[PDB]
Ligand binder design. Structure first.
Ligand SMILES: Cc1c(F)c(Oc2cccc(C(=N)N)c2)[nH+]c(Oc2cccc(C(=N)N)c2)c1F
Ligand SMILES: [Ca+2]
Ligand SMILES: [K+]
Length: 223
């Protein structure tokens, strides 16, 4: 997250850290047994870390759980990033409390201008590298579809949306991938890709979750 703020410990309860000996991606808990993340975050041997603030300090509210199964969307295109969404089944149910909560799925898609909250442990520098240990937050609006496609000609599919600031200086970044985008208390996006970070006229691109609800619901119910 570039140009954001410190969330505060466990203020974003549904936020998950994906670990393979180190933090590599963000994720969202949608129920006690499932996490949603980005397909580009796929790896063999993931451990799901819940209740996390400082990713490098054991503070007492963490639940570290191994993944039993990973399902990448049947149409994920690694070259275009079209359908960048994956489901992760937890080895055992997480314990829901005030520090670990699930985020609901949307019943409808969000409008441009809707304000959202993006969160992650990703890079905090526009151009340079600095990784935080604590969860960073950022309020950002969904951008109209025309601005999104003007910024990335021929690369935006109907499964993507832009959120951020055209003027640059505030964006999600690498390390944030798979991370949630919550608007009006529903999971509307997953951190997918971008062109650099917080650059002028190159906003963040997100998987539009609203298009995957029937796929999520059907997949979980059967696995
Ligand atoms: C090396 C690299 C990427 F390739 C990338 O995006 C991709 C990767 C693969 C395919 C495509 C594609 N258009 N076909 C785009 N995003 C990056 O930073 C990030 C990562 C996450 C968010 C942001 C962001 N600025 N919001 C930047 C990044 F550092
Ligand atoms: Ca910790
Ligand atoms: K990334």
């Amino acid at each position: 997250i570039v140009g954001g703020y410190t969330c505060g410990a466990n203020t974003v309860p549904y936020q998950v850290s994906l670990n393979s000996g180190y933090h590599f991606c963000g994720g969202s808990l949608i129920n006690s047994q499932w996490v949603v993340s980005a397909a580009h975050c796929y790896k063999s041997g993931i451990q799901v870390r819940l209740g996390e603030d400082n990713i490098n300090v054991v503070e007492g509210n963490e639940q570290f759980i191994s993944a039993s199964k990973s399902i990448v969307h049947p149409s994920y295109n690694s070259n275009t990033l079209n359908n960048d969404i994956m489901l992760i089944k937890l080895k055992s149910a997480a314990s829901l409390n005030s520090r670990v909560a699930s985020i609901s799925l949307p019943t409808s898609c969000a409008s441009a201008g809707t304000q959202c909250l993006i969160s992650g442990w990703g890079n905090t520098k526009s151009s340079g590298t600095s990784y935080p240990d604590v969860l960073k937050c950022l309020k950002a609006p969904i951008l109209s579809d025309s601005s999104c496609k003007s910024a990335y000609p021929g690369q935006i599919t109907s499964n993507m949306f832009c959120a951020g600031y055209l003027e640059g200086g505030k964006d999600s970044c690498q390390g944030d991938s798979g991370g949630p985008v919550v608007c009006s208390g529903k999971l509307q996006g997953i951190v997918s890709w971008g062109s650099g970070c917080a650059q002028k006229n190159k906003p963040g691109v997100y998987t539009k979750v609203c298009n995957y609800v029937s796929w999520i619901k059907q997949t979980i119910a059967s696995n």
